[PDB]
Amino acid sequence: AVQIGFLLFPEVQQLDLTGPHDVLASLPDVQVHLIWKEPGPVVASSGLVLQATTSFADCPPLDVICIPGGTGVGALMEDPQALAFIRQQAARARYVTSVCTGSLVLGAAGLLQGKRATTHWAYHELLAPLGAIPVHERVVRDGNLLTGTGITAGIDFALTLAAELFDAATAQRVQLQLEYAPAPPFNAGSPDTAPASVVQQARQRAADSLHKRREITLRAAARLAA
């Protein structure tokens, strides 16, 4: 059975995780894990309560690891237990993946050094200090690393992983069973397509978070420099 694991942490952006979870859990011969320091309730940034199913110590070797993003990424970038777990699993995983600001956690773990990668548009400047080659594309692959932008990045890349773990017909069948054919009613999902006034509002609302994450990123980079 293919072993797929998602890191589940306080103040996660739950859709980053729950989207790919439902897609991948639809495949045959997969087992999906929700990993934290111990099993039990973990609260997402919206207040939605999720349950972790396994601890770091009990998690099996994973074929796919996925790091979601969210407010809670700042704490995780300086959590030595979580970073060590990610490094251990990434060494043997077939696919190391992240959604949105989850790539900043991969960066803090040292896994983006010399690698092409993306992250959420408002935090993209934080990739270079973590050793990455920043790329402004929605899905960036470098070897077995796959970083994606957008809250639903993992739904799309889950279909790619289904096709590569199984076959194209299997991925197509899952897509049809889920009737997955998005059609957003607005075209403001990128700073290059949204109105300038909207981009300003969004940048202003992210400013305090970006400032705090600049500080965290520099400490994380210092640890990598040692």
Q: Which residues are catalytic?
A: 100
Residue 47 or 143: the one with the smaller Cβ distance to a copy of itself is 47
> For residue 77, which phi and psi values (nearest 5 degrees)?
-70, -15
Neighbour-count burial of 11, counting CB atoms closer than 10 A to its CB (0-12 exposed, 13-18 middle, 19+ buried) = middle
Closest approach of Cl ion to the CB of residue 179, in Å: 6
Binding Cl ion by CB under 5 A: which of 147, 152, 158, 159? 152
Cα–Cα distance between 52 and 114 in angstroms, integer? Answer: 32
Which residues ranging from 47 to 86 are in contact with a copy of itself (CB under 8 A)? 47-51
Binding a copy of itself by CB under 8 A: which of 81, 113, 144, 201? 201
Binding a copy of itself by CB under 8 A: which of 88, 129, 133, 156? 156
Number of chain positions touching a copy of itself (CB under 8 A): 64
Which residues ranging from 162 to 221 are in contact with Cl ion (CB under 5 A)? 180, 182
In angstroms, how far apart are the furthest CA atoms of the chain? 49
Q: For residue 202, what is the enclosing H or E element?
A: helix 196-225
Mask: binding to a copy of itself, 136-155, rule CB under 8 A, as x and -? --x----------xxxx--x
**Binding span for Cl ion by CB under 5 A among 57-65, 92-100, 152-160, 164-172:** 152-160
Residue 46 or 113: the one with the smaller Cβ distance to a copy of itself is 46
Residue 204 or 225: the one with the smaller Cβ distance to a copy of itself is 204
AA letter at 6? F
- Tell me which residue of 96, 85, 103 sits closest to 63, measured CA to CA: 96
Binding a copy of itself by CB under 8 A: which of 205, 212, 214, 219? 205
Residue 72 or 150: the one with the smaller Cβ distance to Cl ion is 150
DSSP notation for 45-113: TTS-EEEE-EETTTPPPPSEEEE--STTHHHHTT-HHHHHHHHHHHHH-SEEEEETTHHHHHHHTTTTT
AA letter at 217? T
Residue 87 or 180: the one with the smaller Cβ distance to a copy of itself is 180
Which residues ranging from 103 to 132 are in contact with a copy of itself (CB under 8 A)? 120-121
Closest approach of Cl ion to the CB of residue 153, in Å: 5
Neighbour-count burial of 22, counting CB atoms closer than 10 A to its CB (0-12 exposed, 13-18 middle, 19+ buried) = middle
Cα atoms found within 13 Å of the Cα of residue 69, Cβ hemisphere only: 22
> Which stretches of the chain bind Cl ion, using CB under 5 A?
150, 152, 180, 182
